[PDB]
């Protein structure tokens, strides 16, 4: 009964339920129950997922000491989410030397010289959604923002993580990575059923699938992110390889959708950001110009509109490392087995660090006010060697839509638009309902 | 499905079943199932626990690698075997750089000469197993040994584990340390279900239990075992040492009385062994003198006999170490996760370094032959810095047992000795049939 275990080290935090421990306090959601912590506990904190003691901190100094400087020695590995199946070789569920490899080894495909030669791979499906919201901007009626980006974030997907072109809008039959489309609330009450769904062969992800994925693989082994791992420590296995790509699409999918839709209540409801995005926008691209890798490392005013947006809903909302041993950090004592959180939407929204945090404001980001952020307050992307290997992928494949997105359309909100925004209530952070917008051609 | 595993590394074994692996072929016994493949596969061969891959070696550098060279940075740890509770602290269950802490924190206990302090308060109870012999001796009818042995074992362990002096022989009602005295297959096969009864309270080690141990511990904090924990990296915490003191509960008890069990049935059934261990022990203690330190360190021949019986009997059986990462070792490539195993009790009866290996010779390990014996070969005690810990003390407990016992007495077989000798079909080698002897007073 380790439930005794913050209170034996003198930390505060919510008195945990036995067998529960504090995950009834998740009706709120993992974000509300993260801020009510916050302030009313201060620093550090700790709670029980279960009988998992999870140990928050909001310091600076330790935040970097988890995420950067004890990252290899003690803080290397998340901790286990489920019954992971084969994709325990996922850079994102592999620890220690194992994850070490990986990420040595996916490292090149990150870069930004890999990154240009998939902005004209990517602005093709930039065009793609356009055609697909002049359809229903011309119609002159409301748009599900999650449709069209939700199509674009998977014509993106597959076109570079396999090169297959697609208009997934309007090929819905064809459903080459439909892989995609109550359980981790009793899976952490009760770990111990992790290991049993692994001899069930029940996996988290629908694995009768896969079986399509590696058999289709066998049609790459004789640019996207498939060729840029086969030519690859040890080479990159067929089967390690093939997990890679399936957290790609999971990582490239649901993520830019939300965000996207984050980006554009924004926009619409700030509609002088929006239009003086658009001015930027019109001014670097001239006359509807074809938008590049340069160029989109030029908008400033659109790379501060993402950042913010950013702040206001960090899409994976914690960062959690595992303490592999008994440590003593910046003061403080953490014994092995805990899992370190770090609440970046509670830190995103902290009026310790930011002014109206509720409030919209894409010149925090400024180039006079952006020095005066903390890279450990803000951390959408994480930070340190297990940060978000697809961060500047990710933002790169967001801005290439918002321009050409508003390079012809402007957005209102409609009656149906949900104002204020309401976060949904289960544990991805996206809409409770989703956006709509009525789209004007310009 | 990682049944594949051995197959995929061109390693020989016998083939897993699905769910079950190779767990089916220890209907003969552990020792049994390693004979034959020892005999049938060669150096090394790999077979599945449940669906544990467990990789065999019968190499003497390759073990020297694993037990000795590699230890601290490959294979440091055992796998875990069932719901551990708060047992967890146990030096024989810790990992890692905790492991590493209590191994150095419980080191200087076990020293020669902390051993030599203790000479005299186990001595008293050699003299108290005659005095329950020559109860069964001028009763004139036969023994079972392990009910003396089994009572000797517990004598020296409360006396030196705690100071408690009992006759458990003879005070059977007072239940100081009865915390002693179908399941282990399933948690094989089943190895997800030892988290589950973690969560349940359930615990290997009778948990209802413990509360009279660290209460009546609470009579130590204000020579024996307990007293040189205390006076002691970081100190011991007080359920630390608790923890210890129960390891050492059942590694001092199950284990001398089962080995002087196989002692007496070697010398009852080679009485020219018994006879000239006798001489050597009246020369060297003339009159029935008492056994002390340095004589017992003297006595060659019962060194030799010890040492036989524990080649014919090692009751440990095998050595296990986990590989936790991905390395290759002496020429082949073990794969992070794969149980390393030493078949101790294999290796003992290996013909390609014993010759007649079921005879009981104990002349093997005499000052002219003692040298040409491999260090990695015979293993009763383990090797490295995670071998028994307890060797010193276990053998010196022996030996001052059999001095006293064999000063006063002689053994012969019975009618109802079990000759030859069966051991058990279970997992502790032990004598199917106990062992019964007749006692004649010299
Ligand atoms: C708006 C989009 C995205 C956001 C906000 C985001 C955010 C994050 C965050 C916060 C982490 C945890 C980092 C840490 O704990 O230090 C992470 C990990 C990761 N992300 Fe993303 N991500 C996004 C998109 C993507 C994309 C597009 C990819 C790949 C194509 C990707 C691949 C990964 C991987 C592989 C990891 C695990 C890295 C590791 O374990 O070494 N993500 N992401
Ligand atoms: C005839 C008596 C005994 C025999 C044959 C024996 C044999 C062994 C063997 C083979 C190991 C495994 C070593 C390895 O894997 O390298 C071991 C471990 C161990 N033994 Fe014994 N043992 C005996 C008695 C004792 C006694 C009397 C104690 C304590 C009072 C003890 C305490 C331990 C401990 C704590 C470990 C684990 C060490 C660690 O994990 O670091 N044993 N023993």
Same mark, same amino acid.
């Given at each position: 009964?380790?439930?005794?275990?913050?209170?034996?080290?003198?930390?505060?935090?919510?008195?945990?339920?036995?067998?529960?421990?504090?995950?009834?306090?998740?009706?709120?959601?993992?974000?509300?129950?993260?801020?009510?912590?916050?302030?009313?506990?201060?620093?550090?904190?700790?709670?029980?997922?279960?009988?998992?003691?999870?140990?928050?901190?909001?310091?600076?100094?330790?935040?970097?000491?988890?995420?950067?400087?004890?990252?290899?020695?003690?803080?290397?590995?998340?901790?286990?989410?489920?019954?992971?199946?084969?994709?325990? %070789?996922?850079?994102?569920?592999?620890?220690?030397?194992?994850?070490?490899?990986?990420? %040595?080894?996916?490292?090149?495909?990150?870069?930004?010289?890999?990154?240009?030669?998939?902005?004209?791979?990517?602005?093709?499906?930039?065009?793609?959604?356009?055609?697909?919201?002049?359809?229903?901007?011309?119609?002159?009626?409301?748009?599900?923002?999650?449709?069209?980006?939700?199509?674009? %974030?998977?014509?993106?997907?597959?076109?570079?993580?396999?090169?297959?072109?697609?208009?997934?809008?309007?090929?819905?039959?064809?459903?080459?990575?439909?892989?995609?489309?109550?359980?981790?609330?009793?899976?952490?009450?009760?770990?111990?059923?992790?290991?049993?769904?692994?001899?069930?062969?029940?996996?988290?992800?629908?694995?009768?699938?896969?079986?399509?994925?590696?058999?289709?693989?066998?049609?790459?082994?004789?640019?996207?992110?498939?060729?840029?791992?086969?030519?690859?420590?040890?080479?990159?296995?067929?089967?390690?390889?093939?997990?890679?790509?399936?957290?790609?699409?999971?990582?490239?999918?649901?993520?830019?959708?939300?965000?996207?839709?984050?980006?554009?209540?924004?926009?619409?409801?700030?509609?002088?950001?929006?239009?003086?995005?658009?001015?930027?926008?019109?001014?670097?691209?001239?006359?509807?110009?074809?938008?590049?890798?340069?160029?989109?490392?030029?908008?400033?005013?659109?790379?501060?509109?993402?950042?913010?947006?950013?702040?206001?809903?960090?899409?994976?909302?914690?960062?959690?490392?595992?303490?592999?041993?008994?440590?003593?950090?910046?003061?403080?004592?953490?014994?092995?087995?805990?899992?370190?959180?770090?609440?970046?939407?509670?830190?995103?929204?902290?009026?310790?660090?930011?002014?109206?945090?509720?409030?919209?404001?894409?010149?925090?980001?400024?180039?006079?006010?952006?020095?005066?952020?903390?890279?450990?307050?803000?951390?959408?992307?994480?930070?340190?060697?297990?940060?978000?290997?697809?961060?500047?992928?990710?933002?790169?494949?967001?801005?290439?839509?918002?321009?050409?997105?508003?390079?012809?359309?402007?957005?209102?909100?409609?009656?149906?638009?949900?104002?204020?925004?309401?976060?949904?209530?289960?544990?991805?952070?996206?809409?409770?309902?989703?956006?709509?917008?009525?789209?004007?051609?310009?």
């Amino acid at each position: 009964h380790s439930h005794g275990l913050f209170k034996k080290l003198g930390i505060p935090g919510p008195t945990p339920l036995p067998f529960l421990g504090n995950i009834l306090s998740y009706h709120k959601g993992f974000c509300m129950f993260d801020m009510e912590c916050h302030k009313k506990y201060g620093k550090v904190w700790g709670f029980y997922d279960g009988q998992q003691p999870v140990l928050a901190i909001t310091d600076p100094d330790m935040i970097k000491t988890v995420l950067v400087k004890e990252c290899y020695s003690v803080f290397t590995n998340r901790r286990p989410f489920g019954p992971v199946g084969f994709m325990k %070789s996922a850079i994102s569920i592999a620890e220690d030397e194992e994850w070490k490899r990986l990420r %040595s080894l996916l490292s090149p495909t990150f870069t930004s010289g890999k990154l240009k030669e998939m902005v004209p791979i990517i602005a093709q499906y930039g065009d793609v959604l356009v055609r697909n919201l002049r359809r229903e901007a011309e119609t002159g009626k409301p748009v599900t923002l999650k449709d069209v980006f939700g199509a674009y %974030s998977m014509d993106v997907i597959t076109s570079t993580s396999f090169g297959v072109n697609i208009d997934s809008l309007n090929n819905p039959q064809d459903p080459f990575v439909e892989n995609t489309k109550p359980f981790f609330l009793s899976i952490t009450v009760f770990p111990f059923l992790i290991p049993i769904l692994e001899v069930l062969n029940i996996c988290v992800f629908p694995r009768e699938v896969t079986n399509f994925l590696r058999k289709s693989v066998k049609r790459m082994k004789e640019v996207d992110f498939l060729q840029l791992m086969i030519d690859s420590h040890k080479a990159l296995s067929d089967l390690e390889l093939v997990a890679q790509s399936i957290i790609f699409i999971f990582a490239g999918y649901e993520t830019t959708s939300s965000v996207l839709s984050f980006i554009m209540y924004e926009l619409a409801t700030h509609p002088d950001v929006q239009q003086k995005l658009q001015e930027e926008i019109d001014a670097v691209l001239p006359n509807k110009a074809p938008p590049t890798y340069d160029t989109v490392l030029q908008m400033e005013y659109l790379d501060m509109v993402v950042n913010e947006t950013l702040r206001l809903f960090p899409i994976a909302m914690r960062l959690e490392r595992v303490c592999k041993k008994d440590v003593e950090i910046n003061g403080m004592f953490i014994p092995k087995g805990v899992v370190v959180m770090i609440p970046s939407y509670a830190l995103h929204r902290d009026p310790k660090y930011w002014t109206e945090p509720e409030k919209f404001l894409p010149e925090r980001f400024s180039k006079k006010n952006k020095d005066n952020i903390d890279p450990y307050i803000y951390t959408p992307f994480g930070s340190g060697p297990r940060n978000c290997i697809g961060m500047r992928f990710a933002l790169m494949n967001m801005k290439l839509a918002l321009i050409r997105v508003l390079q012809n359309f402007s957005f209102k909100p409609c009656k149906e638009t949900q104002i204020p925004l309401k976060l949904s209530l289960g544990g991805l952070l996206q809409p409770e309902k989703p956006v709509v917008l009525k789209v004007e051609s310009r």
